[PDB]
Amino acid sequence: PTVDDVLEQVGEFGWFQKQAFLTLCLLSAAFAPIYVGIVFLGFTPDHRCRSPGVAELSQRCGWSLAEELNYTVPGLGAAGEAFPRQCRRYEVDWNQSALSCVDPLASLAANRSHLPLGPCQHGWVYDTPGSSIVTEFNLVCADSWKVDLFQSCVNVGFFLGSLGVGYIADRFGRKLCLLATTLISAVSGVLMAVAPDYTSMLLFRLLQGLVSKGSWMSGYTLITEFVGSGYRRTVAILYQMAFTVGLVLLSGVAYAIPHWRWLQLAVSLPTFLFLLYYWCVPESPRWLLSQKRNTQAIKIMDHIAQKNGKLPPADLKMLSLKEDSTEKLSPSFADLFRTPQLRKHTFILMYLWFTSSVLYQGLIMHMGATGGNLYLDFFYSALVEFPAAFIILVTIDRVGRIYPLAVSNLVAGAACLIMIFISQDLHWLNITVACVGRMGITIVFQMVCLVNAELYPTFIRNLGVMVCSSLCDLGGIITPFLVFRLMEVWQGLPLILFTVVGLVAGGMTLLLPETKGVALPETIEDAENLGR
């Protein structure tokens, strides 16, 4: 009368499982905006120093946007690529000076560089009709570094939340966390749009980043526990796929409304609707059974059978774990580093997460020149993944869950290697090679997440995945400085490091035990002898 058997008797993947999966998918899409970053909320358009006198002259004679930029703004390429043109103003009086539009400023100085440069007061004038956070607070030239501060603070908040948010979810149940965390994320998101100053917005974003990771991973583990053993692959992969679909929808809606405040409010509000949809999904039976609350476990098991429409088995009265467990099974950080096998698995998974994150960031950094439209580039970036999801689904069932991950990691490493050695000059081959590498990285990410979730015991699963994911955020934070520093030593040093890291990760993946068609463990001692 183990949990898996009764779950099989009523139905592994029935009407109930599909219903829960639909709402969990809705939750998954809602996590994309927080993790996308500042791409659609902090895009920096072209900008020049506002000048009161230019407005009067703009209407006197025929003018064009291109023409105005050329012989009204200081020229670029002097003492920097574009530093002068960006945020320097000549300050030559353009008002009460009828010098003809043919020769507005040429006559005065007979030279452009030698003309006087003043402060870039009067705020700024931006190109895009929409408004971004940069445009809101003039974080352009003097405070340009504040954008880096904001993004780095968000990343640090994400790392800390990954390190900490797991324990509350594990100890107090998965439904409770998925409710409180998503509620906090929703109330903060709608609050950010009303943030008056720079500090308040940063604080609200930090809170949202601290909680969203916990929300998403709690949902993931809940659905994975609910689905039967055989169909774990399908549910997990399609959950990640729903996250990608949400990303695509985010790109579309972002193009729809450019204003950042309205975008944030519109993205945040539906999270309250999801919170309304909490009534459906109950607590995971496995967690309740491990916590020794068998009465609620059996009550839930009756409902799923009712919704499935299949008669429940008569043996539920004696439902319990395989062996008589202890009264208390409290999770703790200490328990995560006691069993040598568990310690080895944790180290390997942490290293795999770190390598995946660093290699992904490196690959996106070494890409080609960005396209004219940011939205189209982001849409293609998201679109590349769906074939990756299709490939992952087919191979997991038959090949296993180790060889695909190892080969994908090695493929990403080799893609970086070929990008380095073979001619990297602009060619049609480079874009396809980059897409291949991106596909490999996506496969690595999905496989790592699935295997890590499936490897740990049930009563600590969320905490383990959280800790092993924190290294992903750490690597994402640290890699840019590493790549900038290494470039100084030698021209192509970074790509050699990427290739060696990928090869080592692919080699190390082999030690991890396979998990093809094996019921996920529920006791630490049971997980110790998983390989044997």
Ligand X SMILES: *[C@@H]1O[C@H](CO)[C@@H](O[C@@H]2O[C@H](CO)[C@@H](O)[C@H](O)[C@H]2NC(C)=O)[C@H](O)[C@H]1NC(C)=O
* Interaction site with ligand 2PM (CB under 6 A): 35, 240, 244, 360, 385, 442, 445, 469, 472
Specify whether the CB–CB gap between 110 and 75 falls below 8 A: no
Task: Give yes or no for residue 111 binding ligand X (CB under 6 A).
Answer: no
Residue 34 half-sphere exposure, CB side, CA atoms within 13 Å?
33
Q: Which stretch binds ligand X (CB under 6 A): 63-71, 163-171, 320-328, 434-442?
A: 63-71
Q: Which stretch binds ligand X (CB under 6 A): 65-73, 275-283, 484-492, 522-530?
A: 65-73
Q: Which residue is nearest to ligand X (CB)?
A: 70
Q: Considering beta carbons, is residue 477 or 496 the nearer one to ligand 2PM?
A: 477
Residue 206 CB contacts under 8 Å (≥ 6 apart), including other chains? 153, 154, 157
Q: Considering beta carbons, is residue 106 or 311 the nearer one to ligand X?
A: 106
Encoded tokens for 428: 């049609």
* Separation between Cα atoms, residue 496 and residue 421, nearest integer Å: 10
- The helix/strand/coil state of 156 is helix
Task: Give yes or no for residue 76 binding ligand X (CB under 6 A).
Answer: no
Task: Give yes or no for residue 63 binding ligand X (CB under 6 A).
Answer: no
| Total interface residues for ligand X by CB under 6 A | 4
Q: Which amino acid is at 345?
A: H
Task: Give yes or no for residue 106 binding ligand X (CB under 6 A).
Answer: yes
Give the torsion sign (CA, 72, 77, 81, 87).
negative
Q: Considering beta carbons, is residue 101 or 153 the nearer one to ligand X?
A: 101
User: How many Cβ atoms are within 10 Å of 397's Cβ, its own excluded?
Assistant: 13
Q: Cβ 459 to ligand 2PM, closest distance in Å?
A: 22
Choosing from 59, 62, 65, 70, the residue that interacts with ligand X (CB under 6 A) is 70
Q: Which does 264 bind (CB under 5 to 8 A by kind): ligand X, ligand 2PM, none?
A: none
Residue 429 has phi, psi (to 5 degrees) of -70, -35
Q: Which does 71 bind (CB under 5 to 8 A by kind): ligand X, ligand 2PM, none?
A: ligand X
Q: Considering beta carbons, is residue 253 or 384 the nearer one to ligand 2PM?
A: 384
Q: Considering beta carbons, is residue 383 or 486 the nearer one to ligand 2PM?
A: 383
**CA-to-CA separations, 349 to 156, 206, 344, 400, 476, in angstroms, rounded:** 21, 27, 9, 17, 16
Q: Considering beta carbons, is residue 182 or 240 the nearer one to ligand 2PM?
A: 240
Task: Give yes or no for residue 71 binding ligand X (CB under 6 A).
Answer: yes
Q: Which residue is nearest to ligand 2PM (CB)?
A: 445
Specify whether the CB–CB gap between 186 and 275 falls below 8 A: yes
User: How many Cβ atoms are within 10 Å of 56's Cβ, its own excluded?
Assistant: 12
Q: How many helices (H) and strands (E) does the chain have?
A: 23, 2
Q: Which stretch binds ligand X (CB under 6 A): 66-74, 204-212, 290-298, 471-479?
A: 66-74
Residues near ligand X (CB under 6 A) are 67, 70-71, 106
